[PDB]
Protein backbone atom coordinates (compact mmCIF):
# COMPACT_ATOMS: atom_id res chain seq x y z
CA UNK A 1 0.00 0.00 0.00
CA UNK A 2 0.99 3.64 0.28
CA UNK A 3 -1.02 5.26 3.09
CA UNK A 4 -2.33 4.64 6.60
CA UNK A 5 -4.14 6.29 9.48
CA UNK A 6 -3.41 5.45 13.10
CA UNK A 7 -4.69 6.54 16.49
CA UNK A 8 -2.55 5.94 19.56
CA UNK A 9 -4.17 5.86 23.00
CA UNK A 10 -2.21 5.85 26.25
CA UNK A 11 -3.88 5.59 29.68
CA UNK A 12 -1.60 5.80 32.71
CA UNK A 13 -2.55 5.35 36.36
CA UNK A 14 -0.74 7.30 39.07
CA UNK A 15 -2.00 6.38 42.56
CA UNK A 16 -2.01 9.43 44.81
CA UNK A 17 -1.76 11.91 41.95
CA UNK A 18 -5.30 11.94 40.64
CA UNK A 19 -7.17 9.76 38.17
CA UNK A 20 -5.43 8.03 35.23
CA UNK A 21 -4.30 10.40 32.48
CA UNK A 22 -5.62 9.64 28.98
CA UNK A 23 -3.83 10.88 25.86
CA UNK A 24 -4.76 10.26 22.24
CA UNK A 25 -2.95 11.29 19.07
CA UNK A 26 -3.89 10.64 15.46
CA UNK A 27 -1.55 10.21 12.50
CA UNK A 28 -1.79 9.88 8.73
CA UNK A 29 1.45 8.15 7.72
CA UNK A 30 4.21 10.00 9.61
CA UNK A 31 2.20 13.21 10.09
CA UNK A 32 0.39 13.83 13.37
CA UNK A 33 -2.88 15.71 12.92
CA UNK A 34 -4.77 15.70 16.25
CA UNK A 35 -4.22 15.39 19.98
CA UNK A 36 -6.24 15.19 23.20
CA UNK A 37 -4.86 15.19 26.74
CA UNK A 38 -7.17 14.73 29.73
CA UNK A 39 -4.67 16.72 31.80
CA UNK A 40 -5.05 19.90 29.72
CA UNK A 41 -6.40 23.03 31.44
CA UNK A 42 -9.57 22.59 29.38
CA UNK A 43 -9.46 19.17 27.62
CA UNK A 44 -10.41 19.35 23.96
CA UNK A 45 -9.31 17.78 20.69
CA UNK A 46 -6.76 20.10 19.08
CA UNK A 47 -5.39 20.31 15.50
CA UNK A 48 -1.76 19.47 14.85
CA UNK A 49 -1.66 19.66 11.07
CA UNK A 50 -2.69 22.64 8.82
CA UNK A 51 -5.08 20.56 6.67
CA UNK A 52 -7.29 19.40 9.55
CA UNK A 53 -8.14 22.94 10.68
CA UNK A 54 -10.80 23.21 7.97
CA UNK A 55 -12.95 20.58 9.66
CA UNK A 56 -16.09 22.09 11.18
CA UNK A 57 -17.20 22.58 14.83
CA UNK A 58 -19.19 19.34 14.82
CA UNK A 59 -16.02 17.42 13.91
CA UNK A 60 -14.14 18.77 16.92
CA UNK A 61 -17.00 18.41 19.38
CA UNK A 62 -17.62 14.85 18.20
CA UNK A 63 -13.93 14.06 18.67
CA UNK A 64 -13.83 15.66 22.10
CA UNK A 65 -16.87 13.72 23.32
CA UNK A 66 -15.31 10.48 22.12
CA UNK A 67 -12.01 11.15 23.91
CA UNK A 68 -13.75 12.39 27.07
CA UNK A 69 -15.82 9.21 27.12
CA UNK A 70 -12.69 7.16 26.44
CA UNK A 71 -10.95 8.88 29.35
CA UNK A 72 -13.62 7.35 31.60
CA UNK A 73 -13.68 3.95 29.89
CA UNK A 74 -9.91 3.46 30.01
CA UNK A 75 -9.88 4.26 33.71
CA UNK A 76 -12.36 1.43 34.18
CA UNK A 77 -10.14 -0.79 32.05
CA UNK A 78 -7.06 0.01 34.15
CA UNK A 79 -9.00 -0.96 37.29
CA UNK A 80 -10.05 -4.20 35.59
CA UNK A 81 -6.54 -5.19 34.47
CA UNK A 82 -5.11 -4.38 37.89
CA UNK A 83 -7.51 -7.02 39.15
CA UNK A 84 -6.80 -9.56 36.39
CA UNK A 85 -3.18 -9.56 37.55
CA UNK A 86 -3.91 -9.39 41.29
CA UNK A 87 -1.91 -6.17 41.43
CA UNK A 88 -1.72 -3.67 44.27
CA UNK A 89 -3.57 -0.36 44.10
CA UNK A 90 -0.25 1.33 44.88
CA UNK A 91 1.50 0.87 41.54
CA UNK A 92 1.21 2.86 38.33
CA UNK A 93 0.25 1.00 35.18
CA UNK A 94 -0.27 1.73 31.51
CA UNK A 95 -2.68 0.58 28.81
CA UNK A 96 -1.63 1.42 25.25
CA UNK A 97 -3.72 0.87 22.13
CA UNK A 98 -2.90 1.36 18.44
CA UNK A 99 -5.55 1.03 15.75
CA UNK A 100 -6.10 2.12 12.20
CA UNK A 101 -6.33 1.25 8.54
CA UNK A 102 -3.84 0.70 5.72
CA UNK A 103 -4.71 1.57 2.12
CA UNK A 104 -3.05 0.17 -0.99
CA UNK A 105 -1.45 2.52 -3.57
CA UNK A 106 -4.85 2.39 -5.29
CA UNK A 107 -6.82 3.55 -2.26
CA UNK A 108 -8.37 0.22 -1.27
CA UNK A 109 -8.28 -1.17 2.27
CA UNK A 110 -5.19 -3.34 2.57
CA UNK A 111 -5.69 -4.33 6.20
CA UNK A 112 -6.93 -3.13 9.58
CA UNK A 113 -5.22 -2.96 12.98
CA UNK A 114 -6.23 -2.97 16.66
CA UNK A 115 -3.52 -3.88 19.17
CA UNK A 116 -3.32 -3.34 22.91
CA UNK A 117 -0.54 -3.62 25.47
CA UNK A 118 -0.41 -3.50 29.27
CA UNK A 119 2.72 -2.12 30.92
CA UNK A 120 4.53 -2.31 27.57
CA UNK A 121 3.69 -5.95 26.88
CA UNK A 122 1.33 -7.21 24.19
CA UNK A 123 -2.07 -7.90 25.75
CA UNK A 124 -4.73 -8.47 23.10
CA UNK A 125 -4.92 -7.91 19.36
CA UNK A 126 -7.58 -8.14 16.67
CA UNK A 127 -6.47 -10.70 14.07
CA UNK A 128 -6.12 -9.75 10.40
CA UNK A 129 -9.55 -11.30 9.71
CA UNK A 130 -10.94 -8.44 11.84
CA UNK A 131 -13.16 -11.10 13.42
CA UNK A 132 -11.10 -13.04 15.96
CA UNK A 133 -8.70 -12.12 18.76
CA UNK A 134 -5.30 -13.25 20.01
CA UNK A 135 -4.88 -12.94 23.79
CA UNK A 136 -1.38 -12.93 25.30
CA UNK A 137 -2.27 -14.61 28.61
CA UNK A 138 -5.11 -15.77 30.86
CA UNK A 139 -5.81 -12.19 31.88
CA UNK A 140 -6.24 -11.07 28.27
CA UNK A 141 -8.46 -14.12 27.79
CA UNK A 142 -10.92 -12.50 30.20
CA UNK A 143 -10.99 -9.38 28.04
CA UNK A 144 -11.35 -11.62 24.98
CA UNK A 145 -14.35 -13.45 26.43
CA UNK A 146 -15.83 -10.07 27.33
CA UNK A 147 -15.31 -8.64 23.84
CA UNK A 148 -16.56 -11.78 22.09
CA UNK A 149 -19.75 -11.71 24.16
CA UNK A 150 -20.24 -8.03 23.28
CA UNK A 151 -19.45 -8.43 19.56
CA UNK A 152 -16.65 -5.86 19.78
CA UNK A 153 -14.75 -7.26 16.80
CA UNK A 154 -17.78 -6.52 14.63
CA UNK A 155 -17.82 -2.90 15.78
CA UNK A 156 -14.09 -2.45 15.18
CA UNK A 157 -14.35 -4.06 11.75
CA UNK A 158 -17.23 -1.77 10.79
CA UNK A 159 -15.06 1.22 11.67
CA UNK A 160 -11.90 -0.04 9.98
CA UNK A 161 -13.65 -0.84 6.68
CA UNK A 162 -15.89 2.21 6.75
CA UNK A 163 -15.16 5.45 8.60
CA UNK A 164 -11.42 4.78 8.87
CA UNK A 165 -10.91 4.45 5.13
CA UNK A 166 -13.42 7.21 4.34
CA UNK A 167 -11.79 9.80 6.57
CA UNK A 168 -8.27 8.72 5.62
CA UNK A 169 -9.07 9.27 1.94
CA UNK A 170 -10.57 12.64 2.86
CA UNK A 171 -7.46 13.70 4.80
CA UNK A 172 -5.21 12.55 1.96
CA UNK A 173 -7.11 14.80 -0.47
CA UNK A 174 -7.28 17.81 1.85
CA UNK A 175 -3.57 17.58 2.63
CA UNK A 176 -2.42 16.20 -0.73
CA UNK A 177 0.25 18.89 -1.14
CA UNK A 178 2.11 17.41 1.84
CA UNK A 179 0.70 13.96 2.65
CA UNK A 180 1.06 12.90 -0.97
CA UNK A 181 4.48 14.48 -1.45
CA UNK A 182 7.64 12.50 -0.75
CA UNK A 183 10.75 14.57 -0.04
CA UNK A 184 13.97 12.79 -1.04
CA UNK A 185 16.85 12.78 1.43
CA UNK A 186 19.74 15.19 0.95
CA UNK A 187 22.82 12.97 1.08
CA UNK A 188 26.56 13.23 1.64
CA UNK A 189 29.47 11.29 3.14
CA UNK A 190 31.72 12.71 5.84
CA UNK A 191 35.18 11.44 6.80
CA UNK A 192 36.56 11.36 10.35
CA UNK A 193 40.08 10.04 11.00
CA UNK A 194 40.08 7.99 14.21
CA UNK A 195 43.74 6.96 14.17
CA UNK A 196 46.74 6.74 11.85
CA UNK A 197 45.25 3.83 9.94
CA UNK A 198 41.48 3.94 10.43
CA UNK A 199 38.83 6.50 9.59
CA UNK A 200 35.06 6.77 9.99
CA UNK A 201 32.89 7.16 6.91
CA UNK A 202 29.46 8.52 7.85
CA UNK A 203 26.68 8.52 5.28
CA UNK A 204 24.03 11.19 5.91
CA UNK A 205 20.39 11.40 4.84
CA UNK A 206 18.62 14.64 5.72
CA UNK A 207 15.30 16.39 5.19
CA UNK A 208 13.35 13.37 3.96
CA UNK A 209 9.69 12.38 4.27
CA UNK A 210 8.25 9.88 4.94
CA UNK A 211 10.51 8.34 7.59
CA UNK A 212 10.88 5.00 5.77
CA UNK A 213 14.41 4.80 4.39
CA UNK A 214 17.21 2.30 3.79
CA UNK A 215 20.82 3.27 4.49
CA UNK A 216 23.59 0.71 3.99
CA UNK A 217 27.37 0.48 3.56
CA UNK A 218 29.03 -1.94 1.17
CA UNK A 219 32.67 -2.99 0.92
CA UNK A 220 33.66 -4.37 -2.49
CA UNK A 221 29.96 -4.70 -3.26
CA UNK A 222 29.41 -6.55 0.02
CA UNK A 223 27.22 -4.87 2.64
CA UNK A 224 28.68 -4.37 6.13
CA UNK A 225 25.54 -4.95 8.20
CA UNK A 226 27.53 -6.27 11.16
CA UNK A 227 30.14 -3.49 11.02
CA UNK A 228 27.77 -0.59 10.35
CA UNK A 229 26.60 1.76 13.08
CA UNK A 230 23.07 2.82 12.14
CA UNK A 231 21.33 5.41 14.32
CA UNK A 232 17.57 5.50 14.78
CA UNK A 233 15.70 7.68 12.29
CA UNK A 234 15.04 10.96 14.09
CA UNK A 235 12.62 13.88 13.52
CA UNK A 236 14.05 17.24 12.46
CA UNK A 237 11.04 19.17 13.75
CA UNK A 238 9.89 20.48 10.36
CA UNK A 239 8.08 17.23 9.42
CA UNK A 240 11.23 15.71 7.90
CA UNK A 241 13.59 13.07 9.27
CA UNK A 242 17.32 12.43 9.53
CA UNK A 243 19.46 9.31 9.64
CA UNK A 244 23.10 8.27 9.31
CA UNK A 245 25.12 5.08 8.99
CA UNK A 246 28.81 4.85 9.77
CA UNK A 247 31.59 2.33 9.26
CA UNK A 248 35.20 2.37 10.42
CA UNK A 249 37.52 1.64 7.52
CA UNK A 250 41.27 1.20 6.90
CA UNK A 251 42.97 4.40 5.75
CA UNK A 252 43.48 4.31 2.00
CA UNK A 253 40.68 1.80 1.41
CA UNK A 254 37.84 4.34 1.49
CA UNK A 255 37.02 3.96 -2.19
CA UNK A 256 36.18 0.29 -1.70
CA UNK A 257 33.16 1.46 0.31
CA UNK A 258 29.84 2.66 -1.06
CA UNK A 259 26.75 4.02 0.65
CA UNK A 260 23.39 2.96 -0.76
CA UNK A 261 20.25 4.99 -0.17
CA UNK A 262 16.68 3.89 -0.87
CA UNK A 263 13.74 6.25 -0.34
CA UNK A 264 10.25 6.62 -1.79
CA UNK A 265 11.24 10.10 -2.91
CA UNK A 266 14.11 8.70 -4.98
CA UNK A 267 13.37 7.60 -8.58
CA UNK A 268 16.29 5.19 -8.28
CA UNK A 269 18.36 4.07 -5.25
CA UNK A 270 21.49 6.15 -4.64
CA UNK A 271 25.12 5.09 -4.41
CA UNK A 272 27.53 7.47 -2.67
CA UNK A 273 31.22 7.34 -1.83
CA UNK A 274 33.52 9.70 0.03
CA UNK A 275 34.76 12.51 -2.21
CA UNK A 276 37.97 13.99 -0.70
Amino acid sequence: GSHSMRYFYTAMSRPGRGEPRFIAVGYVDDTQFVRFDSDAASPRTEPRAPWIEQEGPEYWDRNTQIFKTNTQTYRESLRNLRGYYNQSEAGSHIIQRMYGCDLGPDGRLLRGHDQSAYDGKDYIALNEDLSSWTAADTAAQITQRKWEAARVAEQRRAYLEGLCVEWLRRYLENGKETLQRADPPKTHVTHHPVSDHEATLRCWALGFYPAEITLTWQRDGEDQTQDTELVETRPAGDRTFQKWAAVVVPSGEEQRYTCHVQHEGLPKPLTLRWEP
Binding site: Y7, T73, I124, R156
Partner: peptide, 10 residues
Protein backbone atom coordinates in the same frame (compact mmCIF):
# COMPACT_ATOMS: atom_id res chain seq x y z
CA UNK B 1 -11.86 10.35 12.64
CA UNK B 2 -11.50 7.95 15.60
CA UNK B 3 -13.41 4.82 16.61
CA UNK B 4 -16.92 5.61 17.92
CA UNK B 5 -17.50 5.73 21.67
CA UNK B 6 -18.39 4.28 24.07
CA UNK B 7 -15.90 1.46 23.59
CA UNK B 8 -16.17 -1.71 25.67
CA UNK B 9 -13.99 -1.75 28.79
CA UNK B 10 -11.24 -4.37 28.95
Amino acid sequence: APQPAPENAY
